[PDB]
Write a protein that binds this DNA or RNA. Structure first.
Length: 164
RNA sequence: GGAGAGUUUGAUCCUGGCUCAGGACGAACGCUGGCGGCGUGCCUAAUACAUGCAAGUCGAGCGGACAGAUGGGAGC
């Protein structure tokens, strides 16, 4: 479901772009921030915010990021299975890793996976490197993940009839 | 066992090349320089080389030699 946002959230930002609109007078600027928000227990989200200022943009981005939250399975502090998330010419593979590796990821992917609470990720972006579409690609790859308990419940099966 | 970033625009998303962050040398150059261990050290002209050595040995295969004096005598 929609994750109700009443938690403690850490809310760090990826980028603020300076973003123009041409009028009869000339260029009129705004600041478009996108901020990733989530506790490190499995709830992530991100949001965009636009204003004339930097801090109001970060305000609106943190609000819209708290609105849309997603869940991620944290099976053994990793992800359950390797997946490619592909939101619109941003394609990012995610492998589970062993317990020592640390989050191996680039900047906004690293922000999603650190604010997810997932600790051991092999990952790589195989597409364009805008932060917005890469964050959408990561959360596409984390929405399509599957729990072994839930897939065992899906196949009319038991967990040990899957895991061995 | 797998990290990306800058740059086409007034602003943006893609495509797209270019550029960077890494590890390596039989490396060289520049600045600098303490030792020890272990390794390596003409990549070029298979260009030309003074000098010194780098393949000799067996007298239990052989003939002749050179010394040598165990005793033997020789001239003062």
């Amino acid at each position: 479901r929609i994750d109700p946002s009443k938690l403690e959230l850490e809310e760090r930002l990826v980028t603020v772009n300076r973003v123009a609109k041409v009028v009869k007078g000339g260029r009129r600027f705004r600041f478009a921030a996108l901020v990733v928000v989530g506790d490190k227990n499995g709830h992530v989200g991100f949001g965009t915010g636009k204003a004339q200022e930097v801090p109001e943009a970060i305000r609106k981005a943190v609000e819209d990021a708290k609105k849309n939250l997603i869940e991620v399975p944290m099976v053994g502090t990793t992800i359950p299975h390797e997946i490619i998330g592909r939101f619109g010419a941003g394609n990012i593979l995610l492998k589970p890793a062993s317990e020592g590796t640390g989050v191996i990821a680039g900047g906004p992917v690293r922000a999603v996976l650190e604010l997810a609470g997932v600790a051991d990720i092999l990952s790589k972006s195989l597409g364009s490197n805008t932060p917005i579409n890469m964050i959408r690609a990561t959360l596409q790859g984390l929405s399509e993940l599957k729990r072994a308990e839930d897939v065992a419940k899906l196949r009319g099966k038991s967990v040990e009839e899957l895991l061995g």
